[PDB]
């Protein structure tokens, strides 16, 4: 067998379709091996360092691999190695990537409609940003549509509970599109239609944002996204026309969620807890959720609980519709100070509201919200329906 | 080729990285074979009977297998064979498991963040509990977090329509956590943060419970869970802080769903039909859904229909919010006797209620609910809005 791709490049096939065995990609590693088939005439093909290897006399060895690629095929070593380049080659390869293990990277870009990534769990199959890297661990570029990101973790320096972060990092960024193509869904140039699903992905341990979807991107679907341990903002969205189902964000130093300039969004099933988490040392108050400058939002079946300051702050927003909403036991950083929903120059229709303050119910004495609603201005038009005061006994008269 | 792993254990390599072909795991079967590679220095590697095989001389043979394991790698035979140990070895292996076929098991435990399981369908790829086994077919242990269970069946004795059950069986049990770790998500000891996803899993044919999530577990997500043919209770949950989407439970001898001591839960999209199923012979009335001793629940877009007794019984519960609810044509075991929603010492806000009783509409004469609402106590605080009486013609004056 050939002992490495370096030797494969020095091995000329003598017959078309010739089978060769590659022991491993890189000498002494036993990783990334496989069977390859030769094309004597290799014009048209480009060496990519893992599934198309070209020889000195211009043949192409083709890896026999019907479906997805994995970083080991392109030279990844796992462990403490920097696997950025092999991961980047996978997503650029022309096929979906499967993550089979944990791989350190610095920054990765998804560019094509083939740049899907699949794992097998929210922890063990993962990309992990190297400690000295800054910026976005994964960026979805405006040329990338119709992909799936499914069942893997995106972890940063602070991923483990109670640990410190690398400044200036983001887990997944969706960049603002710079143009509009006219050949969707076959486009290869900038286009606003992301039309992609992020499903069962776990983001943890970044500084600025877990997930940050910038303005101008349509139909970024999330489903069962799980974000935790973010030094600042768990999830930011600044765009229009999307649906998220079953989002969960937990333990953020500032907001769990920022909606800023959003429109025509749906959130269906969500849990935002432990925002403004005091050990993360953020200076100042931030709510569990900011809804700012937004409009035509439908937010159903969410909960905001155990946040250090206000629950939900709705500001300068029109036509916010919420149906089934649980906010309780926020204001945890100073007792009897903060409120579960704060309205400022906004209009909202809230139905199915509940909010049993479990600290008042148990009589624990733990810090909790002074009450459910605060109006910071008198020009809001708001309706609220539901169980505004729960009706438990009141062991501590509150 | 080596004829069996037993032979492989008696085959010393004489060159590091040496390739060997294994025809099959166990003699005669033609299953579980593949290519392996030698480590002459075996130490620090443990025989696991499918992917790491140690020789009498201390070398390790390592299966060439980048991604998921399957039970056939570890000696499973399929068909009528008890594959419990092969399947247990997979979920213990350090990688996710793929089920490629139906395997009989007695009882499996999921213990690690690597213990994911994937199939390719809600039926053909499955675990099937042996008629000789009792207890939990799958137990998720309190050390197991961040896994995915996706697209496979979990079947017991009664899975086929109209068949009998083995006493004392449960499909999937999530045990009560015995401790709290301080290094999530990298924990290896008990923790309440399950943070896992059960997606497109079909549970059928168990005695006591299809799915039973015990108290103290956070964020067990379910997505497109299908439970049917359960002798007693389709799904029981007794915990807090979770979301389920598109749950369907069909044909249970007692309740389709028990929420007992739940809080801060969301169910979005659900159908619970044919509870208190008379052929399963249970003694007594059980509702489609029991909500007992619960609080701060948001339950949107569900349907309870065709159940033998009451539709939904809400008892000793605070702050139950329901937005979009369909209950009709329950009480099928005795005409004109049972009610679609029964309130007992509970508070609730129900919006977007509908309940066209299709049997009264068609004039079939089939047994159905006496009416939509019954109050067993007068200390309830309840708001109900929607279409309380549908307004069809009334062929039989009802
Ligand atoms: Cl909804």
Numbering used by the authors:
A (entry chain B), B (entry chain A): 266 to 663
Kindly provide excerpts from the paper associated with this entry.
Likewise, CBA120 with its four TSPs (TSP1-TSP4, encoded by ORFs 210–213, respectively) infects enterohemorrhagic E. coli O157:H73–5, E. coli O77, O78, and Salmonella enterica serovar Minnesota6. TSPs serve as receptor binding proteins that allow for the initial reversible contact between the phage and the bacterial cell. After binding to the bacterial lipopolysaccharide (LPS), TSPs exhibit lyase, glycosidase or esterase activity directed toward the O-antigen part of the LPS that eventually results in irreversible binding of the phage particle to its bacterial target. TSPs form homotrimers, which in the case of TSP1 and TSP3 are broadly divided into two domains.
Herein, we describe the crystal structure of full-length TSP2, which reveals a small head domain formed by a D1 fold module, lacks the D2 fold module, and its N-terminal 168 amino acids corresponding to the interaction region of TSP4 are structurally disordered. The TSP2 structure was refined at 1.9 Å resolution. The crystal asymmetric unit contains two homotrimers, providing two independent views of the biological trimer. For both trimers, 168 N-terminal amino acids have no associated electron density; thus, these were not modeled. The TSP2 trimer assembles into a 160 Å elongated structure with a shape common to other TSP glycosidases, distinguished by having a head-like region, neck, and an elongated body. The structured region comprising amino acids 169–921 can be broadly divided into the two canonical tailspike domains; the N-terminal head domain (residues 169–244, or ~ 8% of the entire 921-residue TSP2 polypeptide chain) and the C-terminal body domain (residues 256–921, or ~ 72% of the entire TSP2 polypeptide chain), which are connected by a 12-residue α-helical “neck”. Unlike TSP1 and TSP3, both TSP2 and TSP4 contain an additional fold module preceding D3 (designated D3′), which adopts an open face β-sandwich fold comprising an antiparallel 4-stranded β-sheet with β-strand topology 1 2 4 3 warped around a 2-turn α-helix. For TSP2, the structure suggests that the active site is also located within an intermolecular cleft, with Asp506 and Asp571 positioned 6.4 Å apart, and oriented appropriately to form the acid/base catalytic machinery. Replacements of the two aspartic acids by alanine residues abolished the halo formation, thus confirming that Asp506 and Asp571 comprise the catalytic machinery.
